[PDB]
């Protein structure tokens, strides 16, 4: 058939056949918490504030394509509130959004998210990543090979996910640049490192991985399917 076509069938897009046997020569596996071990879109785990505030925040968040923004919009919609007309929308990706509704200035910006109305913090959200099911693939590889979780998220969130999925080595509160330095150090130390990430917020780290995998949500392997199990199946 052809390696390239066989891999597509399994929802992997490969860049070079070399990545193939290179898989066997690697010894370290690194996961990005967000998007790989968890779904690409987080959920609202709690909202504190009144329903008008909720409608205001969702109405502004409805103009962003950020996953946190989508988590907030979905939660508000499940609560039954309707989207309101916003003017003067402004966004700074991943950090905050702003807009005007009913003569009032609303800001939603990085509990995890505060809602301001005319300068005053009046509501907030806790949002969390949702883990992907399938937990045995991990042990299998822990058999055959060291696993590491990296994340720009806070200690307690990262640790807790490490706890659930049963992963020992993990680093938290990392900037993209922290991750890149970690890869280089592993490679300096002699490790052949395969990394799985979102493909953007950690593109430099991937670019340095011995073999890099991007989620479907440049890299050596693109997981169109977002099927990590099948990737870990292959590796294992």
152 is in an annotated binding site: yes
CA distance readout (Å), 53 to 50, 63, 81, 93, 163:
5, 17, 10, 21, 35
From CA 152, how far away is CA 104, in angstroms rounded?
A: 33
Of 105, 137, 139, 138, the closest CA to residue 122 belongs to 105
Q: In whole angstroms, how close is the CB of 127 to Mg ion at the nearest point?
A: 7
Q: Tell me whether residue 153 is annotated as binding.
A: yes
The minimum distance between CB 235 and Mg ion, in angstroms, equals 32
CB of 55 to Mg ion, least distance (A): 15
The CA distance from 39 to 56, in Å, is: 26
Question: Judged by CB under 5 A, does residue 44 bind Mg ion?
Answer: yes
Q: Interacting stretch for Mg ion, rule CB under 5 A, among 40-48, 113-121, 187-195, 200-208?
A: 40-48
Q: Does 69 bind Mg ion (CB under 5 A)?
A: no
CA distances from 191 to 26, 83, 84, 196, 198 (A): 7, 51, 53, 16, 22
Q: Does 70 bind Mg ion (CB under 5 A)?
A: no
The Cα–Cα gap between 37 and 1 comes to: 31
- Residue 156, marked binder: no
C-alpha distances in Å from residue 95, one per residue of 73, 195, 201? 16, 26, 13
Burial group, residue 29, by CB count within 10 angstroms (0-12, 13-18, 19+): buried
12 is an interface residue for Mg ion by CB under 5 A: no
Find the part of the chain contacting Mg ion (CB under 5 A) among 8-16, 70-78, 133-141, 164-172: 70-78
**Residue 207 binds Mg ion, judged by CB under 5 A:** no
Query: CA 47 to CA 125: how far, in whole Å?
Result: 5
Residues 81-110 within binding reach of Mg ion (CB under 5 A): none
75 binding Mg ion? (CB under 5 A): yes
Query: Among residues 7, 71, 86, 206, which is the contact residue for Mg ion, using CB under 5 A?
Result: 71
Residue 43 or 101: the one with the smaller Cβ distance to Mg ion is 43
Count of residues interacting with Mg ion (CB under 5 A)? 5
Task: Please give the radius of gyration of the chain, using alpha carbons only, rounded to the nearest integer.
Answer: 20
- Should residue 41 be labelled a site residue for Mg ion when binding is judged by CB under 5 A? no
Query: From the annotation, which residues make up the binding site?
Result: 33-34, 61, 66, 71, 151-153, 179, 201
List residues near Mg ion by CB under 5 A: 43-44, 71, 74-75
């Amino acid at each position: 058939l052809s390696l390239y076509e066989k891999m597509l069938h399994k929802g992997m897009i490969i860049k070079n056949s070399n990545v193939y046997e290179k898989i066997k020569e690697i010894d370290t596996i690194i996961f990005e918490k967000t998007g790989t071990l968890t779904y690409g879109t987080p959920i609202v785990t709690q909202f504190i504030g009144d329903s008008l505030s909720l409608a205001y925040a969702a109405s502004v968040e409805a103009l962003s394509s950020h996953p946190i923004a989508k988590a907030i919009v979905k939660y508000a919609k499940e609560q039954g509130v309707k989207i309101l007309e916003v003017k003067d929308f402004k966004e700074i990706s991943g950090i905050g959004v702003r807009g005007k509704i009913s003569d009032k200035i609303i800001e939603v910006k990085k509990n995890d998210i505060a809602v301001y109305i005319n300068g005053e913090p009046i509501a907030s959200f806790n949002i969390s990543d949702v883990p992907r099911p399938n937990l045995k693939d991990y042990l299998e590889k822990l058999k055959n090979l060291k696993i590491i979780i990296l994340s720009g998220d806070k200690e307690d969130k990262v640790k807790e996910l490490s706890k659930e999925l049963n992963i020992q080595e993990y680093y938290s509160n990392l900037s993209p640049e922290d991750k890149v330095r970690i890869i280089e150090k592993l490679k300096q130390n002699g490790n052949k490192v395969l990394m799985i990430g979102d493909g953007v917020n950690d593109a430099a780290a991937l670019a340095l991985a011995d073999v890099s995998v991007a989620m479907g949500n440049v890299a050596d392997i693109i997981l169109v399917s977002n099927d990590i199990g099948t990737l870990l199946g292959l590796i294992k």
